[PDB]
Write a protein that binds this ligand. Structure first.
Ligand SMILES: COc1cccc(-c2cccc([C@]3(C)CC(=O)N(C)C(N)=N3)c2)c1
Ligand SMILES: COc1cccc(-c2cccc([C@]3(C)CC(=O)N(C)C(N)=N3)c2)c1
Lengths: 376, 376
C-alpha cells in the first residue's frame, strides 16, 4: 500500500481526485473521488474548462451499450452515453477491469472552471446508480472481477491540498489510536446514524431522530458538514452563543457572506469543538468523533476583494439530511468496510492541529434506543 | 404601458430578462428579473459564456465606490466592484437613474452557458442587499429619483418563452377577473404567508405554520415551486397517490431523474390541480391560487438522449422555505405593490390552458388564526 499513499490531489472546496486510466491504450484522466454517488462518469467531449477528456474512438476495448443517461442536480446536470471499457488506477491495485463508463456528452454547472479533474468516480452503491440499480458501480466490478477485498479507505488532508485512497485495505501509517466502526444502515448512500451531538461539551437535548432526518451520509464529494434545518438552527444557536467574544455578520452563518481576519488573528479558542456520536457495533454502545474549528471554518483562498485570512462557515442546511463532507473527513482516516457493512473512523495522521486541542475518536459510550434515531 | 408589454424574454428554466442600458453613452445589456435578490450585478469582464459585458472605461458617468462584494451561493458565487452609473430601461419608463451597479469581475457557476443574459436585477429589498442594507437597490433609487410609483407587475408566459414587466403600474390587458392581495409580511424578500394547501380539492391537515417554515417567498429567479421537506414529503405523498393511474420512477419525484412520454401522450388528468391559500388583507379572510399540472411539470427541452415529451417535476425541497418560483408565477399576473406592502395575484391572460381546467384566483375564504402560520 506504500504505492497508494498520497495518490489524491485537490481541496475540499474543489474535491479530491485520483489519477485513472481508461481504454486501450490507456487514456489518463483525473477523476473525483465521490462517496456520495455511484456512477463513473467522465467527460468525453471538449468542454472548454476540461484539460483532458475520454476519446472512445481511440480505444480498442470500448463497447457501446446503446443507452444514454441524464442526471439532473440542484441547478446542475450531466448527460452521456453508457458503455464499458478497461479501467486501471495507476497508483492503485495492480489490476485492470471492465467497468461501466458514462461518457459525458453534455453538462450544465457540473465541471469547475480552473479545476483539474474531468470525471467522477461514484463509490456509493447500485441502489442510487443512474439510470437504475443494474448499472453496476465501478467498485463492485472491481471486487467482482479481481481478488481485491471489498473495502477502501480515505485520508483527505489539506492545509491546494492532498490525500490518500487505499484500495483494498488499511494503512496504519495514516492514522493514530484506534479505529471505531459505525454500521452502514443501508447500502445506497453510505448512510450512518448519528445518536447524539455536542458542542464543546454540552449536548442539544434534541430527539436524535432529527439528527438523521431523513438521512445521514458520508460524502467525500460534499464540501460542508451539512445539517438539517432544525439541527442546524439548533446547532448554530449554540455555536453562535458559544462564540460571542466577538460579533460576526448575521447572514454569514447562512453562508451568504464570508467572514475575515488577517494573518495570526484567527480567533481559535472562541470556537467550540463539535462532537458527533455515531451508532456503534454493539447494542446500546456508541463512539464519538470530535471536530476542531479548523475543520468547520475553511479558508476561502484568493478573494481579490481582500488580502486577509477569510473563511466560509463550513456548516449548512439540508432538505436531504446530515452530510458529513470533506470538512468532517479531513479530520479522520475513514474506512469504508463494504465487506462488513460498516464505516470506521480514526484520528487522521494528517489533521491540522494546534498545540492545544485535537480531533478525537473515543469510546465506548452507553446510549439507549439508538435504533430509534433512524428515520423510517 | 403599451410600451412595456412583452419586454421580457427567456424561460423559467433559464430566467426572464429585460433589456437595460447602463453608462454614458448607453451600453445595452440583457438582465435577469429576479425578485429573490436585491443587487443589480452585471458582468464586467469577458467571461466566455457572455454575449455582452459592462465596460466602465467607456462611461462618462461611472463612479467607482472603491469597495468590493463577494456573494456565495450553493455551489455558486460572484464577486465584483461597487460603483454607480446611469441606468435606463429601453422598454420601460422614459426616465434615467443613478443606481448602484456591482461590476462582476469573477464568478463560479453563476452565468449559464448558452444563456442570453449578462446580469441580474435584484428587485427585492435593502435588508438582503449585499454587502449590507445601505447598498440601495435599483428600484428604490428608481422611485426615489423619479415620479415612477412604487410598484411593478410581472406576467411571465412561455409555452423558448416571453413575458412583460410593467414598471410603475398595472396593465389590465395582462389578466382576467380580479386581483387579490396578500400582505408582504416583511420587506426583505417578498415574503408572504400560506395558510392552507389543497391538492385537487382536499387539504393536508398540516399545521399551516409548516407551510411557512421558516419563510415563504415569491421569486421570479427560482424555477420550481419549492416546498419545505415536511410539506414536500406530505405534498408528494398526496400527488403521487392521486396520480396512480400509472407508475413513474421513485427518484423522479426527488428531481434526480426526469420523466417522459411522446407527442399527445402527456396524461393531463391523472394529475391534480394544486391550491395555495394566501393570507388576505382582512382579519380571518384568505384567497386561493390554483395551479394546473402544466405549471408544476415543465418540459425539459432538448435532451438528445430522446425525441420524446420529457418533463421535470417542478416541485422540490427546501431548507430555506416555500419558494413560489416561475413555475407558479407563469399562471398569474403578479403585482408587487411596494407602496401598500402587498402582492396581488390574478389569472394571467397568458397562462397555458387546456379546454378543461384552468388557473384560478378566488375568494374570499374564512380562515382563522392566519397570523399563527408565520414562523418567528
Ligand atoms: C469536495 O468535493 C467536491 C467539491 C466540489 C464539487 C463536487 C462535485 C461536483 C459535481 C458533482 C458532484 C456530485 C456527483 C453531486 C453532488 O452534488 N454531490 C453532493 C456529490 N456527492 N457528488 C460533486 C465535489
Ligand atoms: C428562472 O430564473 C432563473 C433560472 C435559472 C437561474 C437563475 C439565477 C441564476 C443566478 C443567480 C440567481 C439568484 C441571484 C440566486 C438564487 O439562487 N436565487 C434563488 C435567485 N432568486 N436569484 C438566479 C434564475
Amino acid at each position: 500500500f506504500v504505492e497508494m499513499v498520497d495518490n489524491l490531489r485537490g481541496k475540499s472546496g474543489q474535491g479530491y481526485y485520483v489519477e485513472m486510466t481508461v481504454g486501450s491504450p490507456p487514456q489518463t484522466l483525473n477523476i473525483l473521488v465521490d462517496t456520495g454517488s455511484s456512477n463513473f462518469a467522465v467527460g468525453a467531449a471538449p468542454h472548454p474548462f476540461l484539460h483532458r477528456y475520454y476519446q472512445r474512438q481511440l480505444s480498442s476495448t470500448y463497447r457501446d451499450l446503446r443507452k444514454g443517461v441524464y442526471v439532473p442536480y440542484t441547478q446542475g446536470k450531466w448527460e452521456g452515453e453508457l458503455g464499458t471499457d478497461l479501467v486501471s488506477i495507476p497508483h492503485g491495485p495492480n489490476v485492470t477491469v471492465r467497468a461501466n463508463i458514462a461518457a459525458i456528452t453534455e453538462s450544465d454547472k457540473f465541471f469547475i472552471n480552473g479545476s483539474n479533474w474531468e470525471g467522477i468516480l461514484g463509490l456509493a452503491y447500485a441502489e442510487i446508480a443512474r439510470p437504475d440499480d443494474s448499472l453496476e458501480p465501478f467498485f463492485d466490478s472491481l471486487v467482482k472481477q479481481t481478488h481485491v477485498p471489498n473495502l477502501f479507505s480515505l485520508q483527505l488532508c489539506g492545509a491546494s491540498v492532498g490525500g490518500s485512497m487505499i484500495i483494498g485495505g488499511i494503512d496504519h501509517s495514516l492514522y493514530t489510536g484506534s479505529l471505531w466502526y459505525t454500521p452502514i444502515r443501508r447500502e445506497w448512500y453510505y448512510e450512518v446514524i448519528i445518536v447524539r451531538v455536542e458542542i464543546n461539551g454540552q449536548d442539544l437535548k434534541m430527539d436524535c431522530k432529527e439528527y438523521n432526518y431523513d438521512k445521514s451520509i458520508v460524502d467525500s464529494g460534499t464540501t460542508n458538514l451539512r445539517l438539517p434545518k432544525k439541527v442546524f438552527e439548533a446547532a448554530v444557536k449554540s455555536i453562535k452563543a458559544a462564540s460571542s467574544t466577538e460579533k460576526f455578520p448575521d447572514g454569514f452563518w447562512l453562508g451568504e457572506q464570508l467572514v475575515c481576519w488577517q494573518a495570526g488573528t484567527t480567533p481559535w479558542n472562541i470556537f467550540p469543538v463539535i462532537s458527533l456520536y455515531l451508532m456503534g457495533e454493539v447494542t446500546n454502545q456508541s463512539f464519538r468523533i470530535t471536530i476542531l474549528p479548523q475543520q468547520y471554518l475553511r479558508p476561502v483562498e484568493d478573494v481579490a476583494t481582500s488580502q486577509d485570512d477569510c473563511y466560509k462557515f463550513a456548516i449548512s442546511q439540508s432538505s436531504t439530511g446530515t452530510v458529513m463532507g470533506a470538512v468532517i473527513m479531513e479530520g479522520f482516516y475513514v474506512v469504508f468496510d463494504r465487506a462488513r457493512k460498516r464505516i470506521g473512523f480514526a484520528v487522521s495522521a494528517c489533521h491540522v492541529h494546534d498545540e492545544f486541542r485535537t480531533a478525537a475518536v473515543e469510546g465506548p459510550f452507553v446510549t439507549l434506543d439508538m435504533e430509534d434515531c433512524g428515520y423510517n
